[PDB]
Amino acid sequence: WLDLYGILGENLDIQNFLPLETSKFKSLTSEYKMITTRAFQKLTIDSLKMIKSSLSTFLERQRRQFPRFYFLGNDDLLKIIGSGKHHDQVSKFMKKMFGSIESIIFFEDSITGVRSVEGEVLNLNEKIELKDSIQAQEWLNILDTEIKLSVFTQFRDCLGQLKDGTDIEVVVSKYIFQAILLSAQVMWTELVEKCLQTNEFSKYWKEVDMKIKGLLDKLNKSSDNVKKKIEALLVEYLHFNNVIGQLKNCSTKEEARLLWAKVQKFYQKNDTLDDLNSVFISQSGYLLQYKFEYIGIPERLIYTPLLLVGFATLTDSLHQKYGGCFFGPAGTGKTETVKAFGQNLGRVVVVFNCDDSFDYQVLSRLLVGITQIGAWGCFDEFNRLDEKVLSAVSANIQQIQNGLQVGKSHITLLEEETPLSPHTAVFITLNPGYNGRSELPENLKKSFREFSMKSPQSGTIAEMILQIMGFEDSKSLASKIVHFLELLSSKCSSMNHYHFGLRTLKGVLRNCSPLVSEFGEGEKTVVESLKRVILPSLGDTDELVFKDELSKIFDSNSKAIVQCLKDAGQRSGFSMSEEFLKKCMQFYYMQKTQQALILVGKAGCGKTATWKTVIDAMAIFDGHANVVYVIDTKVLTKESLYGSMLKATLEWRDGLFTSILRRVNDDITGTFKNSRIWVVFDSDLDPEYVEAMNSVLDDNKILTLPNGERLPIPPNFRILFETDNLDHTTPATITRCGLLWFSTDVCSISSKIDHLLNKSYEALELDKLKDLISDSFDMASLTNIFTCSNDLVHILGVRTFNKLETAVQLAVHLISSYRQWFQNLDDKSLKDVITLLIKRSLLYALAGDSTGESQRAFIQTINTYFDSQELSDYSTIVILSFSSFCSEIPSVSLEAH
Amino acid sequence: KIFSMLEKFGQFHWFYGISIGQFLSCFKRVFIKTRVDEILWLLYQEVYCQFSTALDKKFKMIMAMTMFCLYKFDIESEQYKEAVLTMIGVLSESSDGVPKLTNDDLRYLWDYVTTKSYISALNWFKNEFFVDEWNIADVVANSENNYFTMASERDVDGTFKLIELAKASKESLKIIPLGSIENLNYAQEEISKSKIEGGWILLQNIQMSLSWVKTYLHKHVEEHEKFKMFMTCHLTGDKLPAPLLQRTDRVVYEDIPGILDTVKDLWGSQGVWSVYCTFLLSWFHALITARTRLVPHGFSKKYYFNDCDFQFASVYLENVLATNSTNNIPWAQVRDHIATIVYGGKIDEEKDLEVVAKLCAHVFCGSDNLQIVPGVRIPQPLLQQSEEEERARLTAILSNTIEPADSLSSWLQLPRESILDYERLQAKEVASSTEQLLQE
Ligand SMILES: Nc1ncnc2c1ncn2[C@@H]1O[C@H](COP(=O)(O)OP(=O)(O)OP(=O)(O)O)[C@@H](O)[C@H]1O
Ligand SMILES: Nc1ncnc2c1ncn2[C@@H]1O[C@H](COP(=O)(O)OP(=O)(O)O)[C@@H](O)[C@H]1O
Ligand SMILES: [Mg+2]
């Protein structure tokens, strides 16, 4: 009702469009007023849903007015339009429209600036007074323009300050990161061109080196926001130093000019009167226009040679308004390359995770959403689309390309004419040759420019990043890390989930970053990070191989967490073996820096118990309330998991995981702000079910819904994967998650008996009965009986480790049932009756799934391997006297009928 | 006998099926375009030109060999019979034996096969007997049928050929890809509109909407003058209905197997330095597409260099030539960008990057005397010529070149053993197929 009143019941000159909708809204207003009066002194929801259907055209026209509303759902659109005067509802959706902006600064009912996701604050050039009668799209459009003008102002006066002769160490504390970055790149390309006019490069190389060392010195003593800014400028300046050093080593001028042509250059026109088109980027001759869109302080990529060649081929594709195509094995840096190219071009690249549910209408709606905005669109995992849909959208993509190339003002897609902004572009990242993925038709492949990035340069990445933390010996450590990873990949068993590419290196670095305060920035920290990342995912002999190579190529308290785990198992009835405690430590240390985890082991090997007792340990240690949502992936279909499009009226219905993500993002009652939320996919990892979450699992942390909704993943939202085997699990989702392999079972037989017995007596004097049944469960006979039970041929083959539960539950039920006649007999009779019941339970739980002769052999061996009461094949207890089945047969004389 | 041959071809592959209406229409065109032997000869060339375009390259050579066979076995003697059969047999690695000396063309074939040249030996019959060939333009122009279909393997598309054909015909193509019900309805509305008022239409990937193709297209083709229908399907895709394919003209599109023919095609499809650069780019594209077919030795995998790479490389060459107007052309930059960005993007391995870098260093040396192939040297343009004179000189120096019989080795600079193995295997397959075909 608040949304309906905001869109129709309060705004004037908005009810002249649809009079029937106005009358329906008035009737609903009268009904809601009557309901509110009755409450103060079911059918309403149905009426609201019925009148929601007529609002689709209104919302489509509203999205046509402001093109960035295409990234919002219908409910989000209702919320953002209905906030006529509150103005705070718009501020929560800026991450959904822009991506790099999380809130709006408000002051005296006027706007002052925006706030980036990384905590950066951008102050607008002129504060805009917000009228009470104004609508959302007008002030949103003028804010979109004002952000670009403010960014240009900061770039201009920062570049003037740098041209005046000051050092960057004082400028980095004044302006936003993008202004410093663009001004530094302009200054660098101007100075490099000046140096290239002559034969001298050593003076500028020394100047850049001293500036880098000064930035590194200032990095340690700076605030966190300034720390991120200096880190990103240091990545850029390391690229500058690398380019200048490569230029200095050129023998002749021709190769120096070629090497300078191959690299991105950031020029500025000195004649244009238009401010926002004054900066153009030149690489290999082609020129692209800077958009001056706000970026914030993103995680800047290390400018590897492969990254520069990818930038060159992306510029070559976009010069003719074609598409950018990146193909290769998973975990090589395709989406990140596209996003870094967009950030260098001063815009936020909007990334879409393709799926089977993306039909022609959904993909075409996304295309008209991004072409009307003018943003850059990345179609991540383009192979996951159906072949029919891929061939069908070829017309739309070719039409977009032709309209961009010929400068057409409008294009017609989805039976409607929409404006086409000249700033838009389309990119695709795809993984060829994977199971369960379609193939692009050639008519569609001719509209994209392919580039292969199979082999990245991990050494340069590791060296630059370790220099960013300021490690004393970066080159040797990076070489040791890369050689160690290569030796681990080449000298281990050829298992399917043994991938040691670049994502594992990034995880090692992200785990080594927060251990500097505990182990010190050096050899100990990097070997501890390598252990904490790679060791949980390795087997048994490969673990010994890992330890041997770690001792070869590398020279070399946790009391509270272990105490918490012990207490959690004590209240849960578990027992700390060496393997169980090792697995708990590995799970904790690997989840500390990885938000997505895969638990792989045999059936009933100890995955659920491991993560449940670790969850209890986290709750004890941190004090945070913890809520967990367990979802079986393959019980539900994809439509019921993620969501479905009601094709009758073209509206969106949420799935289950999407529903959980929405109710944790909405945060109505404040209970999800200071809590951890776990989604456990307790089924098989189907590629078709899990690859729809690739943007969720990687650093994007976003769930690209079909209807354009972009739900971010909060930092306290962690995803588990409990499964049995990875036979069909593709490496794309393997490398995105910290894997925890269970080489052997985490519990012993006797401990499992004790835990099941404790659970059974928790489910219910009793102390004497518990002592007697514990004494009767003698381990010395039980281990040999279980060892002998493996010789029997069992139908429906189950390991004997899993049949303990049936034996203990059956035995406890039998004692509980016959406890009514246990207080009128002596100790020896009680022991004989209980051991007879236990032998019967063990027989029918271990050899109960075998033939009659096998059952007779097993009752023979349980009699020989246990003085006590003998168990015969027909033995039973009747109302408590032992008898046989001979006298229990009743005389049956059937009639004819 | 020819109809039985074509029926066997249709028995091999579903796309190669033949009706009687098309054959009788071709026989009518024989009369439209020693007397009875002259009509028989004209029938042979007319049926070859009409139904060669509906087959791929191996079946093109099979059909050419068996048709030249049937004609010569009719006309010539039994010594000619024995010589041709034993030469096919030694080409098929089934029967080994020298031919009996008599005219002259048999001696030419003996020279061509005793030099271990196999592809040229297969194409000798096509160059000898048949004196005409048909492209897509000749098929579209010389067909009474207003419905056309077009097939190709995966990872190749010939939509640009039809777009060029429509542009040269001053028509208006309208590409409607299939795969969704919205596109099916739009294609129905547009096909009705184009039948009412004229205009061309093209349907892309018709094998992805087989139910609609089986119902609507069947009932439409079964039942204006500036109207044509084009359909594109994949040769390795699912089977298409026989009557609908027999009611439409069938064309199989593939890249031109020749090297010099590819240069001539790319030259005819297009100051003095721009003409020189596009001539060099056409030569380089033909060389790399010729080398691409050799899977194990020319490259490491199977790649596909289409005309989009040629267009992007030509755009880059023009952008370099316009910006760098000081006559100091950055040849090294052009080499690096073509071998790395334009033609090197699809390359996944590293030996293939090395060989494309070697090719780009060979063809873009930027020297006054450049020897791109062992026979032809392309001099640089002078400082006093015009664009038309430069184009005429380049066409003249292109036309005087004669492709050698071993052009897959000398021009590509490859070891001879691999090329001999490839040619021997391909000619053995073709000759074995025509030997099995000619015995029934
Ligand atoms: N340390 C332990 N102490 C006592 N019992 C344990 C211990 N670890 C595991 N178990 C027991 O092992 C049994 C199987 O373990 P768990 O419940 O973790 O299975 P799982 O990994 O979820 O199995 P599946 O993949 O078959 O669903 C449980 O009944 C649990 O009680
Ligand atoms: N210079 C770099 N190049 C490539 N990847 C990098 C670089 N620096 C860091 N990375 C990390 O490598 C990962 C690459 O993921 P990516 O392969 O882009 O995903 P996708 O498989 O969807 O393309 C990212 O998580 C990123 O954090
Ligand atoms: Mg991806």
PDB file of N, CA, C and O in Angstrom, chain A residues 788-819:
ATOM      1  N   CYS A 788      35.467 -59.576  10.918  1.00  0.00           N
ATOM      2  CA  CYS A 788      34.974 -60.810  10.319  1.00  0.00           C
ATOM      3  C   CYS A 788      33.704 -60.594   9.505  1.00  0.00           C
ATOM      4  O   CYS A 788      33.428 -61.381   8.593  1.00  0.00           O
ATOM      5  N   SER A 789      32.930 -59.549   9.813  1.00  0.00           N
ATOM      6  CA  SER A 789      31.684 -59.296   9.093  1.00  0.00           C
ATOM      7  C   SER A 789      31.904 -58.882   7.644  1.00  0.00           C
ATOM      8  O   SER A 789      30.956 -58.929   6.854  1.00  0.00           O
ATOM      9  N   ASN A 790      33.119 -58.470   7.276  1.00  0.00           N
ATOM     10  CA  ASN A 790      33.379 -58.053   5.904  1.00  0.00           C
ATOM     11  C   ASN A 790      33.422 -59.225   4.932  1.00  0.00           C
ATOM     12  O   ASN A 790      33.282 -59.013   3.723  1.00  0.00           O
ATOM     13  N   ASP A 791      33.615 -60.449   5.429  1.00  0.00           N
ATOM     14  CA  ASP A 791      33.686 -61.607   4.543  1.00  0.00           C
ATOM     15  C   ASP A 791      32.327 -61.950   3.946  1.00  0.00           C
ATOM     16  O   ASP A 791      32.261 -62.521   2.851  1.00  0.00           O
ATOM     17  N   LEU A 792      31.243 -61.627   4.646  1.00  0.00           N
ATOM     18  CA  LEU A 792      29.910 -61.933   4.145  1.00  0.00           C
ATOM     19  C   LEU A 792      29.575 -61.067   2.937  1.00  0.00           C
ATOM     20  O   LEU A 792      29.889 -59.874   2.900  1.00  0.00           O
ATOM     21  N   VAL A 793      28.934 -61.676   1.946  1.00  0.00           N
ATOM     22  CA  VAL A 793      28.493 -60.953   0.759  1.00  0.00           C
ATOM     23  C   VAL A 793      27.166 -60.276   1.079  1.00  0.00           C
ATOM     24  O   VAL A 793      26.167 -60.944   1.362  1.00  0.00           O
ATOM     25  N   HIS A 794      27.156 -58.948   1.034  1.00  0.00           N
ATOM     26  CA  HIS A 794      25.989 -58.157   1.396  1.00  0.00           C
ATOM     27  C   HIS A 794      25.349 -57.578   0.145  1.00  0.00           C
ATOM     28  O   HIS A 794      26.031 -56.960  -0.679  1.00  0.00           O
ATOM     29  N   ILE A 795      24.044 -57.779   0.005  1.00  0.00           N
ATOM     30  CA  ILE A 795      23.286 -57.101  -1.037  1.00  0.00           C
ATOM     31  C   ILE A 795      23.020 -55.674  -0.578  1.00  0.00           C
ATOM     32  O   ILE A 795      22.947 -55.393   0.626  1.00  0.00           O
ATOM     33  N   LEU A 796      22.902 -54.759  -1.544  1.00  0.00           N
ATOM     34  CA  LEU A 796      22.854 -53.318  -1.289  1.00  0.00           C
ATOM     35  C   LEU A 796      24.050 -52.889  -0.435  1.00  0.00           C
ATOM     36  O   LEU A 796      23.921 -52.502   0.726  1.00  0.00           O
ATOM     37  N   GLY A 797      25.226 -53.015  -1.049  1.00  0.00           N
ATOM     38  CA  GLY A 797      26.498 -52.863  -0.369  1.00  0.00           C
ATOM     39  C   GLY A 797      26.694 -51.581   0.411  1.00  0.00           C
ATOM     40  O   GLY A 797      26.825 -50.494  -0.159  1.00  0.00           O
ATOM     41  N   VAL A 798      26.712 -51.713   1.734  1.00  0.00           N
ATOM     42  CA  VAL A 798      26.978 -50.617   2.654  1.00  0.00           C
ATOM     43  C   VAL A 798      28.201 -50.992   3.476  1.00  0.00           C
ATOM     44  O   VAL A 798      28.330 -52.141   3.915  1.00  0.00           O
ATOM     45  N   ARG A 799      29.109 -50.036   3.654  1.00  0.00           N
ATOM     46  CA  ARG A 799      30.260 -50.255   4.517  1.00  0.00           C
ATOM     47  C   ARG A 799      29.803 -50.538   5.942  1.00  0.00           C
ATOM     48  O   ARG A 799      28.794 -50.004   6.411  1.00  0.00           O
ATOM     49  N   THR A 800      30.555 -51.402   6.630  1.00  0.00           N
ATOM     50  CA  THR A 800      30.217 -51.757   8.004  1.00  0.00           C
ATOM     51  C   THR A 800      30.298 -50.565   8.944  1.00  0.00           C
ATOM     52  O   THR A 800      29.655 -50.582   9.996  1.00  0.00           O
ATOM     53  N   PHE A 801      31.066 -49.534   8.579  1.00  0.00           N
ATOM     54  CA  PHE A 801      31.159 -48.321   9.386  1.00  0.00           C
ATOM     55  C   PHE A 801      29.815 -47.610   9.499  1.00  0.00           C
ATOM     56  O   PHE A 801      29.543 -46.953  10.509  1.00  0.00           O
ATOM     57  N   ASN A 802      28.968 -47.728   8.479  1.00  0.00           N
ATOM     58  CA  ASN A 802      27.683 -47.044   8.453  1.00  0.00           C
ATOM     59  C   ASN A 802      26.565 -47.824   9.129  1.00  0.00           C
ATOM     60  O   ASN A 802      25.488 -47.261   9.353  1.00  0.00           O
ATOM     61  N   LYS A 803      26.783 -49.094   9.456  1.00  0.00           N
ATOM     62  CA  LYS A 803      25.745 -49.928  10.043  1.00  0.00           C
ATOM     63  C   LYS A 803      25.751 -49.900  11.564  1.00  0.00           C
ATOM     64  O   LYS A 803      24.912 -50.561  12.182  1.00  0.00           O
ATOM     65  N   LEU A 804      26.679 -49.159  12.175  1.00  0.00           N
ATOM     66  CA  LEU A 804      26.690 -49.015  13.627  1.00  0.00           C
ATOM     67  C   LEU A 804      25.426 -48.328  14.121  1.00  0.00           C
ATOM     68  O   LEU A 804      24.901 -48.671  15.186  1.00  0.00           O
ATOM     69  N   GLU A 805      24.923 -47.355  13.355  1.00  0.00           N
ATOM     70  CA  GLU A 805      23.747 -46.597  13.773  1.00  0.00           C
ATOM     71  C   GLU A 805      22.537 -47.505  13.939  1.00  0.00           C
ATOM     72  O   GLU A 805      21.813 -47.414  14.936  1.00  0.00           O
ATOM     73  N   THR A 806      22.321 -48.406  12.976  1.00  0.00           N
ATOM     74  CA  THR A 806      21.197 -49.334  13.058  1.00  0.00           C
ATOM     75  C   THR A 806      21.326 -50.242  14.273  1.00  0.00           C
ATOM     76  O   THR A 806      20.348 -50.457  15.000  1.00  0.00           O
ATOM     77  N   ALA A 807      22.536 -50.749  14.528  1.00  0.00           N
ATOM     78  CA  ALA A 807      22.755 -51.648  15.657  1.00  0.00           C
ATOM     79  C   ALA A 807      22.471 -50.955  16.982  1.00  0.00           C
ATOM     80  O   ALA A 807      21.735 -51.485  17.824  1.00  0.00           O
ATOM     81  N   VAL A 808      23.028 -49.757  17.180  1.00  0.00           N
ATOM     82  CA  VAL A 808      22.831 -49.060  18.449  1.00  0.00           C
ATOM     83  C   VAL A 808      21.376 -48.645  18.629  1.00  0.00           C
ATOM     84  O   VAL A 808      20.817 -48.785  19.724  1.00  0.00           O
ATOM     85  N   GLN A 809      20.734 -48.134  17.573  1.00  0.00           N
ATOM     86  CA  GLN A 809      19.344 -47.709  17.716  1.00  0.00           C
ATOM     87  C   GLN A 809      18.426 -48.892  18.004  1.00  0.00           C
ATOM     88  O   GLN A 809      17.557 -48.808  18.882  1.00  0.00           O
ATOM     89  N   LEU A 810      18.625 -50.011  17.299  1.00  0.00           N
ATOM     90  CA  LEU A 810      17.816 -51.198  17.547  1.00  0.00           C
ATOM     91  C   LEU A 810      18.037 -51.736  18.956  1.00  0.00           C
ATOM     92  O   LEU A 810      17.075 -52.094  19.646  1.00  0.00           O
ATOM     93  N   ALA A 811      19.295 -51.777  19.408  1.00  0.00           N
ATOM     94  CA  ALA A 811      19.587 -52.284  20.745  1.00  0.00           C
ATOM     95  C   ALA A 811      18.949 -51.411  21.819  1.00  0.00           C
ATOM     96  O   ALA A 811      18.319 -51.922  22.754  1.00  0.00           O
ATOM     97  N   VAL A 812      19.087 -50.087  21.693  1.00  0.00           N
ATOM     98  CA  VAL A 812      18.532 -49.183  22.694  1.00  0.00           C
ATOM     99  C   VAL A 812      17.011 -49.262  22.702  1.00  0.00           C
ATOM    100  O   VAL A 812      16.385 -49.236  23.770  1.00  0.00           O
ATOM    101  N   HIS A 813      16.393 -49.391  21.523  1.00  0.00           N
ATOM    102  CA  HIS A 813      14.944 -49.558  21.475  1.00  0.00           C
ATOM    103  C   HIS A 813      14.512 -50.851  22.153  1.00  0.00           C
ATOM    104  O   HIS A 813      13.495 -50.879  22.853  1.00  0.00           O
ATOM    105  N   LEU A 814      15.272 -51.933  21.958  1.00  0.00           N
ATOM    106  CA  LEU A 814      14.917 -53.202  22.589  1.00  0.00           C
ATOM    107  C   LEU A 814      15.017 -53.121  24.111  1.00  0.00           C
ATOM    108  O   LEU A 814      14.115 -53.592  24.822  1.00  0.00           O
ATOM    109  N   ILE A 815      16.096 -52.519  24.630  1.00  0.00           N
ATOM    110  CA  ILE A 815      16.220 -52.353  26.081  1.00  0.00           C
ATOM    111  C   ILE A 815      15.111 -51.456  26.621  1.00  0.00           C
ATOM    112  O   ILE A 815      14.539 -51.728  27.683  1.00  0.00           O
ATOM    113  N   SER A 816      14.794 -50.372  25.907  1.00  0.00           N
ATOM    114  CA  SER A 816      13.743 -49.467  26.361  1.00  0.00           C
ATOM    115  C   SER A 816      12.385 -50.157  26.371  1.00  0.00           C
ATOM    116  O   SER A 816      11.558 -49.908  27.256  1.00  0.00           O
ATOM    117  N   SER A 817      12.136 -51.022  25.386  1.00  0.00           N
ATOM    118  CA  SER A 817      10.872 -51.745  25.328  1.00  0.00           C
ATOM    119  C   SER A 817      10.764 -52.772  26.448  1.00  0.00           C
ATOM    120  O   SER A 817       9.698 -52.919  27.057  1.00  0.00           O
ATOM    121  N   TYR A 818      11.848 -53.488  26.738  1.00  0.00           N
ATOM    122  CA  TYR A 818      11.801 -54.540  27.746  1.00  0.00           C
ATOM    123  C   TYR A 818      12.173 -54.054  29.144  1.00  0.00           C
ATOM    124  O   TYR A 818      12.274 -54.874  30.061  1.00  0.00           O
ATOM    125  N   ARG A 819      12.382 -52.746  29.326  1.00  0.00           N
ATOM    126  CA  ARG A 819      12.636 -52.202  30.657  1.00  0.00           C
ATOM    127  C   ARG A 819      11.456 -52.369  31.608  1.00  0.00           C
ATOM    128  O   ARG A 819      11.636 -52.246  32.825  1.00  0.00           O
TER     129      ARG A 819
END
